[PDB]
């Protein structure tokens, strides 16, 4: 029962909890503690070949019950421990006895009444470790605590052949080649099935029009239900004239021939529900620090996985399928990509069978039969979304209490995250209490049905992020959660969030998979990366064209209007007269649809905008959702609607309004919104968010200008490049990059004076890799960029396919006379939303991954012998019109500039190391060339998010890897303020570690008014083995990826970027590039940058504390960089930043302050007066030493108790009258008698006994405190007339 000093306070990685600050009637701390003993040999528990995970996990839990102890001790408001609470070892525990009104029976000096018997489920609960604690908002002395199996901590220490990665490194004995895991051969036309292709429209309706055209007519798509039971009469979306390659048998997604040692969860969602020892548990309990019966239990609830999985939407029973079905399914399977919306090929963490169901077959629907009319009907399902062990504990942690209920928002995932596997919080649980806390109920729901009410008006940051959904919840939001807290009157949630997939939205032309390996690998689950990768030349004209149209021009000699190569230079002018001929004739019905003769193409932002799940003005407004992100790729914070969260039902009911279409004829007229069938309640849940935020209160190109301002944590230098003509150029923004171009000759020459800029002269910086005839012709470019299919001569303007006859026969050409000056992935075009490559999703993805410091770079050359790339006489920043400026323009990370990113990282030149590492990229013109991506050398990842801490009534922030981030203005916005402030870590011994977040020991608000964070350079861990006996060219680690070869033709020596750089077969390329394939392992990047060993020097240990920069009402004011009156907002913000590169602290950007401490850092314990590191540094209550209760021999009882005790206090508030305070409490001379009084806590008039607690004005805070030293029994005492 009493305190044991052998248990030491600690922080759990999954929630970063260490202690709860108790407040109200008796303040103090609860905090987690564990046994300090080393030599924990978990590998002594044998795993055989003939047994399953469950009896192994029970043997590990039983073994760890011998090797380790855990508890939640209470401390006073000065940091001093009271009682132990080792839940596995406490003697004769009990639940609390109740009155007939359900109230717990209580009297403060006696404590609670105990029933004399333990709670339910006590034999299986007692082994679990407590990991989070919270206090009731409305009920006194009432608390909740969360318990989990010991493997929810120790999972990282269990043996690697059961706790596998989602990928394997192998022996690499054939030499390493990352294409060996990739299905890569392209599909082909079926030599026996050509005749079923979509028909050309033989006659087209006049509609009383007059214009005419010679171009090939629209394709029909006919679909109708017919009279047969399980066949339509027509179903033209189901047509399938293509088939796969037969390279040593058929190429298709087929798990049983590919995953020979398939990854699967530790336990299934059904096992965790039935095996009561393996589920998480929340219990209510009661505590009183100075009673005889000081602690006892309330109620026990299991956080049952079936109460989450039976609350998933109907579409989550068929995650292999989506509401477009058959045509999308076939286009995906032909391109060798995932089908559905949340399939286990990308997201196995939520599936009971993991990689064993990572295939396109058996989608819950009839598909693949010999007749196109037979496909597209509902059937039985065998691979639904679940909640298996790894995802389950990431869905646990981050508690809050509201009314007669308590919630669980889930963790950051560091209960169960591995290097290649991403368990995350997918929803929220609730426990609700009934009959005055005599009874309970437990439930939970996924974030998809909660966040679906999000809209563009609900954020002061960027618009159009991929956070939208529809009547089918195929957008699946999940978070690494920082926490949930009260920010003054408003309840707030924070963390990092998954968007929809921004990267794989563009889709390949059917034959070209052999030359675009990264885009297919990123679609295959092989490249688990969410950053957008530039690949434009191999994309089809349109992602959504039905596959029966793809064969309409195999030669390319007609530039087949319905299906062709994506390039924007060669597409229609459809003017005042033209639309009535080429497209407005094809009217259609309840059983007919069409594909139109319009030529269509665009760059990455066109593809992304067209088929990503962007937010709009309306909610439920995303009828296309390409896929879901592998890991969190956004910051997040939001205001959560606490009374609506209190008022939502436990059970969620869906119906036929959330089912996918049962047949394709009902899919043909598919309503995007429909009435809930009024017994159902699913649509109520959408309104739990009032407001949200994602980054700075900035808009358009201004957000890219902010991206350049922050320092890179690998070296402390800004991405801006302006603090030092042959000088280098920035990576994210476009200001001062290339040349000032007059846009007055852009468009079809159509209208470009006062249109796009706040000033008389329309000057725009054209960016890197731009196209011009000459420096004298820097304004626009004329049409000359024609592309053949073979050597087959020009695109042929003024030909009959490029003409129409209008009313009165006055024919004219349907093509552009002039074009935009740039296509490069760095492009910013205010005037051209289809040639711009920057986008609002990418602006937020770049913000997060440049904070985490792990944006990759594109390479041709390593630092090795004869391989080297140079700073001098090999790069020309002033000549970005030609190959000597070394812009890749293919395989590059979107929105940014690679050579500038390489320079800011210091991969070439003396920027980051004492000698030139000579790693980089060069655009050669003499021969074909090969390329691949590599990491920055840093190891942080987007799940590395720590405690949400609330600073005051409107300001809050959190730790995020090497940063602390603050959302200072989100609750009460202002004009001219950026709304975010940031502090960087400084310690290179943390920043260059191989799993760096394991050194963070928790974050807290401190008594001097600053948030602070704990760090320990001794807490880092190596990789699972030392590579044993061989060089592991692939080394699985938290910043590794299987980046594929991209191969390309020679760059032109002049006019280099006037056309896109042409790709070639990459399937054999890996043998030509071995020096780059070795640099895929991030340890070799550290070795070549000089960071890989003790060569970093500095502190040998030096653990301790970190603190955010000082702040005032002026901090983050940028009102002179906002607005416009003489130029464009990003350009004046660039002028405003360039005088301030030496003085970033007034912008709210800079390095943290830091202080060292000796020994281990394990965790804080916190209370309203003080914070104690490791629980050391406790105090004598030095402000209150002179204050004490009078002892029983100093009281003359009949002087007090001649009057009944009924009138010694005010009945409306229970404080004792002022004159009787010095009659019961000793106080020093000259003391302020108004600063202290006594509160009655229990009494009985028939015994004349009065029980009291004292309250005093804290010198530090505008609030009352107890005086802890006031007696040998603490702040509580009793007085009675000699009758005790």
């Amino acid at each position: 029962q009493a305190v044991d000093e052998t248990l030491t306070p600690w922080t759990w990685n999954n929630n970063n909890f260490s202690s709860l600050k108790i407040t109200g009637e008796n303040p103090g701390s609860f905090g987690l503690v564990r046994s300090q003993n080393d030599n924990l040999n978990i590998s002594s528990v044998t795993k055989n070949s003939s047994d399953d995970n469950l009896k192994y996990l029970n043997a590990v839990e039983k073994y760890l019950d011998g090797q380790q102890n855990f508890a939640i001790r209470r401390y006073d408001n000065n940091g001093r421990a009271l009682y132990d609470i080792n839940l596995a070892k406490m003697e004769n525990p009990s639940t609390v006895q109740r009155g007939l009104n359900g109230e717990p029976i209580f009297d403060p000096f006696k404590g609670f009444g105990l029933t004399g018997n333990a709670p339910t489920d006590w034999n299986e609960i007692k082994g679990k470790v407590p990991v989070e604690v919270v206090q009731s908002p409305h009920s006194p002395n009432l608390y909740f605590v969360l318990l989990v199996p010991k493997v929810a901590l120790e999972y990282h220490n269990l043996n690697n052949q059961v706790v596998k990665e989602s990928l394997e490194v192998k022996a690499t004995q054939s030499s390493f080649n990352p294409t060996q895991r990739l299905q890569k051969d392209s599909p082909v036309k079926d030599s026996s099935k050509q005749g079923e292709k979509l028909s050309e429209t033989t006659a087209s309706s006049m509609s009383s029009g007059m214009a005419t055209s010679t171009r090939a007519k629209a394709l029909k798509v006919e679909v109708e239900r017919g009279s047969q039971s399980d066949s339509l009469l027509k179903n033209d979306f189901a047509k399938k004239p293509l088939k796969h390659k037969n390279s040593s048998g058929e190429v298709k997604l087929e798990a049983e021939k590919e995953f020979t040692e398939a990854w699967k969860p530790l336990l299934t969602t059904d096992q965790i529900a039935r095996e009561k020892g393996m589920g998480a548990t929340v219990v209510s309990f009661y505590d009183a620090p100075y009673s005889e019966n000081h602690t006892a239990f309330g109620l026990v609830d299991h956080i049952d996985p079936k109460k989450m999985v039976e609350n998933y939407p109907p579409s989550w029973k068929t995650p292999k399928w989506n509401h477009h079905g058959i045509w999308d399914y076939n286009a995906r399977n032909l391109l060798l990509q995932t089908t559905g919306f949340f399939n286990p090929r990308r997201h196995p963490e939520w599936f009971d069978e993991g990689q064993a169901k990572a295939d396109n077959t058996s989608p819950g629907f009839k598909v693949g039969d010999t007749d196109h009319k037979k496909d597209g009907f509902k059937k039985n399902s065998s691979s639904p979304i679940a909640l298996p062990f790894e995802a389950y504990f990431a869905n646990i942690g981050n508690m809050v209490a509201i009314g007669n209920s308590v919630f669980i928002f889930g963790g950051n995932g560091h209960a169960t995250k591995m290097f290649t596997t991403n368990p995350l919080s997918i929803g929220v649980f609730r426990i609700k209490y009934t009959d005055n806390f005599s009874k309970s109920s437990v439930t939970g729901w996924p974030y998809a049905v909660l966040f679906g009410g999000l809209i563009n008006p609900q954020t002061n940051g960027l618009k159009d992020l991929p956070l939208g959904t529809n009547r089918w919840f195929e957008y699946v939001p999940r978070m690494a959660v920082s926490g949930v807290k009260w920010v003054g009157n408003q309840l707030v949630l924070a963390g990092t969030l998954t968007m929809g997939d921004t990267a794989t939205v563009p889709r390949l032309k059917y034959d070209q998979l052999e030359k675009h390996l990264n885009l297919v690998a990123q679609g295959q689950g092989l490249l688990r990366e969410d950053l957008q990768i530039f690949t434009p030349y191999g994309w089809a004209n349109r992602p959504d064209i039905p596959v029966g149209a793809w064969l309409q021009d195999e030669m390319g000699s007609k530039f087949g209007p319905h299906y062709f190569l994506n390039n924007p230079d060669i597409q229609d002018n459809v003017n005042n007269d033209t639309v009535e001929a080429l497209i407005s004739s094809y009217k259609n019905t309840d059983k007919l649809k069409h594909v139109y003769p319009y030529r269509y193409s665009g760059l990455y932002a066109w593809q992304l905008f067209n088929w990503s799940n962007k937010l709009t003005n309306t909610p439920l407004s995303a009828n296309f959702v390409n896929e879901n992100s592998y890991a969190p790729n956004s910051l997040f914070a939001a205001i959560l609607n606490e009374d609506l969260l209190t008022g939502l039902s436990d059970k969620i009911f869906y119906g036929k309004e959330n089912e996918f279409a049962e047949n394709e004829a009902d899919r043909f007229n598919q309503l995007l919104s429909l009435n809930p069938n009024p017994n159902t309640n699913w649509a109520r849940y959408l309104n739990v968010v009032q407001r949200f935020t994602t980054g700075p209160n900035l808009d358009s190109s201004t957000f890219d200008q902010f991206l350049d301002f922050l320092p890179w944590i690998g070296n402390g230098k800004p991405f801006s490049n302006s603090p030092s003509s042959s000088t280098p150029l920035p990576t994210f923004s476009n200001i001062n990059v290339g040349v000032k171009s007059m846009i007055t000759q852009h468009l079809n020459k159509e209208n470009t004076r006062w249109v796009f800029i706040p000033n008389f002269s329309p000057d725009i910086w054209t960016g890197a890799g731009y196209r011009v005839q000459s420096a004298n012709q820097k304004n626009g470019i004329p049409f000359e960029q024609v592309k053949p299919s073979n050597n087959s001569t020009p695109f042929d303007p003024n030909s009959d396919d490029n003409k129409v006859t209008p009313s009165g026969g006055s024919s004219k050409p349907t093509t552009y006379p002039a074009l935009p000056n740039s296509i490069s992935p760095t492009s910013d075009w205010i005037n051209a939303l289809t040639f711009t490559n920057k986008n609002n999703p990418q602006r937020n993805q770049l913000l997060l991954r440049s904070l985490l410091g792990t944006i990759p770079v594109l390479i041709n050359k390593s630092g090795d012998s004869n391989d080297q790339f140079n700073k001098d006489s090999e790069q020309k920043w002033d000549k970005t019109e030609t190959n000597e400026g070394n812009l890749p323009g293919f395989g590059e990370v979107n929105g940014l500039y690679n050579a500038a990113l390489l320079h800011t990282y210091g991969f070439f030149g003396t920027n980051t190391n004492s000698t030139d590492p000579k790693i980089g990229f060069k655009a050669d013109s003499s021969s074909s060339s090969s390329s691949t991506l590599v990491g920055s050398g840093l190891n942080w990842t987007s799940q590395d998010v720590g405690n949400l801490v609330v600073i005051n009534d409107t300001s809050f922030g959190f730790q995020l890897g090497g940063w602390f981030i603050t959302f200072t203005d989100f609750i009460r916005p202002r004009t001219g303020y950026l709304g975010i402030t940031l502090s960087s870590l400084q310690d290179q011994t943390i920043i260059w570690a191989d799993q760096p977040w394991t050194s963070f020991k928790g974050s807290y608000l401190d008594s001097d008014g600053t948030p602070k964070s704990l760090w320990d350079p001794t807490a880092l861990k190596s990789l699972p083995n030392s590579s044993t006996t061989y060089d592991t060219n692939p080394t699985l680690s938290p910043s590794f990826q299987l980046y594929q070869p991209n191969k390309v033709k020679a760059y032109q020596t002049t006019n280099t970027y006037n056309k896109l750089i042409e790709p070639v077969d990459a399937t054999s390329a890996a043998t030509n590039m071995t020096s780059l394939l070795k640099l895929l392992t991030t340890k070799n990047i550290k070795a070549k940058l000089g960071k890989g060993t003790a060569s970093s020097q500095g502190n040998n240990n030096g653990g301790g504390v970190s603190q955010t920069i000082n702040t005032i009402t002026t901090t983050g004011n940028i009102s002179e960089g906002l607005k416009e009156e003489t130029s464009i907002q990003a350009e004046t913000l660039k002028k405003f930043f360039d005088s301030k590169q030496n003085n970033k602290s007034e912008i709210g950007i800079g390095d943290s302050t830091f202080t060292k401490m000796d020994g281990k850092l394990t965790g804080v314990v916190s209370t309203p007066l003080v914070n104690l590191i490791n629980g050391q540094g406790a105090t004598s209550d030095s402000d209150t030493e002179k204050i004490s209760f009078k002892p029983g021999n100093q009281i003359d009882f009949n002087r007090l108790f001649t009057l009944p005790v009924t009138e010694l206090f005010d009945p409306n508030t229970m404080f004792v009258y002022d004159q009787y305070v010095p009659l019961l409490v000793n106080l020093p001379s000259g003391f302020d008698q108004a600063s202290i009084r006594l509160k009655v806590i229990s009494y009985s008039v028939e015994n004349q006994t009065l029980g009291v607690r004292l309250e005093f004005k804290d010198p530090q805070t505008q609030q009352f405190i107890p005086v802890l030293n006031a007696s040998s029994t603490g702040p509580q005492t009793v007085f009675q007339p000699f009758n005790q």
Binding site: S208, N576, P619, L671
Partner: protein
Amino acid sequence: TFLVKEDSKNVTAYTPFATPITDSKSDLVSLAQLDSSYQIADQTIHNTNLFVLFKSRDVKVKYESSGSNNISFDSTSQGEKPSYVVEFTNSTNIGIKWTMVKKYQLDVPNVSSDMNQVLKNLILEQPLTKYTLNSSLAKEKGKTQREVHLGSGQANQWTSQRNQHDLNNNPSPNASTGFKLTTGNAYRKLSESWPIYEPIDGTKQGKGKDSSGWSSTEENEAKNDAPSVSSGTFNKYLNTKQALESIGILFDDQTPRNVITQLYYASTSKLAVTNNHIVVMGNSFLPSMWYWVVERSAQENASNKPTWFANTNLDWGEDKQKQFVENQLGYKETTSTNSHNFHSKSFTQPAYLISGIDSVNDQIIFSGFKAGSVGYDSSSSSSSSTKDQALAWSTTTSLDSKTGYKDLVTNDTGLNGPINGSFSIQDTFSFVVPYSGNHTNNGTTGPIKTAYPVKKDQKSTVKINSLINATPLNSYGDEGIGVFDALGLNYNFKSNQERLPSRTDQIFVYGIVSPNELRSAKSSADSTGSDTKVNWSNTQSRYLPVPYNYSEGIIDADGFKRPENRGASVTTFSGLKSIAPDGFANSIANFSVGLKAGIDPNPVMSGKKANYGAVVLTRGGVVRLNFNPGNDSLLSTTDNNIAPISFSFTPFTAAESAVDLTTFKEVTYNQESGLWSYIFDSSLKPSHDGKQTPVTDNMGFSVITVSRTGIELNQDQATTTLDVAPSALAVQSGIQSTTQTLTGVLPLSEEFSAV
């Protein structure tokens, strides 16, 4: 003490225990000595006095082109049953029994000479129906600008010939001039009668304004295709008799009564009260040109006459917006012999689909959609180029207009005439004209001119007259621009994207009217002979299109348009497909109902009057009207760029959109709570479908909770001046049922309510 409408004639006070009071059921229609044919329309409580609006189904109004008493009740067949507003006071020893106090009879307007000239040739589109189709709405494209101006067979001469036509620099010769009236929805004169059949397709079916043509054979053919209870094929027409009856059109056996009678009986719809005035306006379903203003001191036996909305010079926010609205009414210098129209006789917008009427703090607040009214030709012969054609055009702001709301709305684009059509921008299309003012493909060439689509050589031989639409859609042209305008799809390509306000289509009218200008309105109503105008200063108008999410194919709204959006299946009204779940059969025509002003109960700064904001329902979202109680005027901010603060549109979700708007029964405001409530009575649904199938879901009720949100005015020293419009928030409250017949909701208390 909760007075609840027991039926169409009985109102009874319910105790807070949700129990009727003994001997409290009262027959108000008989209590007011009005025959049983009367019924109660709307009731309000003001100083614990219950007022009632009585509208009878026996009323019959006749219109005569000749004479003075042009609009008068048809007393020949005992049809002189004008509508009454009756003040009822509880006058006893504290037991609920109402009594006559005053009884004001609302009389038909007196038509001046100018209004007479306008109404003689005026024609009203048949009312919007619950079961109405996009295709139904759709009207075949009219003569293009070049066809109207230069004539036929004048191609490639635009450039040359445009100068003398005061159309200089005009970049769209193929710009629609309107919609042909030869087909579509039935356009009938006031003295005529609407049909019960709505054409499925308004490009092919229906005979439009040709009443003689419709009645000759097309009426019989439509009757054959669409019978009245099925046996009908329903391939060209829909028999919407049941829906016409439901939304309040009077019927003689089967044929509806005359249009003047229908308009009057619709105008007797709602009731807002003041300590000195009582105002009555029309319902939301079909327009209402005239609204009665009642002087509470007027004699019991005296006559109360309304004011023509045409005589109410509303302030649309900008003189430029007002002239936009004015210029589409019709040609100005008609001078044929009598071919006068609304614009020619100098009258403003004549028809509003009044969403609702309410009062607070002695101030009256009104809101509603601007009902489209435009000129049309009635030459009947050679013949006019524009013969049998509506003269309307979309007025969307151009792509290069200066960023900012003010600039947007003030943009000269379509000042006088048509300029929009089809255009190409980079890798996408913009139906909006890319240029305005003096902007072109080679520089600056001079101002862009626009003119009314009427040939000048025929200035004396073109007979132009006005019409009134049944919906906000001013221009019915089966065209892309039209659809875009309807759906709110028009966007600029600049750095900061903006929705292009269609200054003359889907316009949303709202404001607060003060007692002085109400007295001015009453004086206008009293005016005899010369017609006198009414000035409403504290009013505003906002382009409020239907959400694009209600139309199949349109996924999002942005400057970049997906190429498939150019297809005829989304370019035209007729090709458009509706996925509207709010009980409407259409997804083009917006519709508003249920304005209820309320006092903000939250504390306010001392010396500052308490906030009162009004909430109005629309298609796919709520609208909050923000007012400055310090001046009792619309909330406004100094920075022009900012959208008028007075306006705030918050979209709905699946639960709110599912709530039929055709079933709005009553709206109650909880004064101490500060939360609205929108009672929807499913029972209001028509008996039979538009295809004569029985309605299977006529049972149930639902409510929507409208709660204030955002940052309010005069909250604290720091919130004395505002920049962000307070925004409402609608949530499906949780009071829903399908098996029950609603009788009334009781705002029992803060924490409780009864059903």
